[PDB]
Amino acid sequence: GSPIPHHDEKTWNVGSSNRNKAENLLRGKRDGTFLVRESSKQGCYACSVVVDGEVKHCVINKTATGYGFAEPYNLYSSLKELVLHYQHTSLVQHNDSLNVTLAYPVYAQQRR
Amino acid sequence: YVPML
Numbered sequence: 001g002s003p004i005p006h007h008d009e010k011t012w013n014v015g016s017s018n019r020n021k022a023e024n025l026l027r028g029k030r031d032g033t034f035l036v037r038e039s040s041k042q043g044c045y046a047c048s049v050v051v052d053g054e055v056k057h058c059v060i061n062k063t064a065t066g067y068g069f070a071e072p073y074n075l076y077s078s079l080k081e082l083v084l085h086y087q088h089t090s091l092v093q094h095n096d097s098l099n100v101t102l103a104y105p106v107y108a109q110q111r112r
Numbered sequence: 113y114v115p116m117l
Contacts, residue, residue: 046113058114070116086116093117 006087009080011105012036019057022048025106026055035106036060036079045079049091051100058091070094 005011014022016038026033026048034049045060045067058069060082065072067079069086076082083102092099 051114056114058116091116094115098114098116 005105005109006080006084006102008109009078011107011109012083012102013079014106019046019048022106023055023057026050029055029106030104032101032103033106034083034100034102034104036083047083047102048106049100049102050104051091051098 012035014035014037018037019039022035022037026035029050031050031053033055034047036045036047038045043064044062046057047060047069048055048057060069060079061067063072066075067082069082069091087102089101090099091101
């Protein structure tokens with residue numbers, strides 16, 4: 001019985017307008033950190049995740065259909081589900097230099 | 113922007 005902090009969308013949701021900022025926040029966290037922000041996209045998102053210590057920006061969705069991490073599957077109108085899947089799934093299946101996952105909430109919230 | 117699976 002453990003109440004994960006990911007259950008909340010604010011734990012990692014930084015909103016929009018935080019590219020070098022959300023990246024400046026990741027610079028220091030531990031490998032596996034991740035944050036979901038937005039941008040001038042048409043409504044897509046970008047999850048700034050720390051990989052091997054070097055934070056990078058990735059995309060979560062591309063075409064209006066859901067919030068997967070690269071491929072459109074199932075539905076769900078929220079990222080909390082996507083982030084939850086990759087939260088335990090490796091992200092190397094696409095890159096052998098990734099092997100990262102959303103295991104650490106960029107802003108976390110295990111305090112108050 | 114890195115491509116994921």
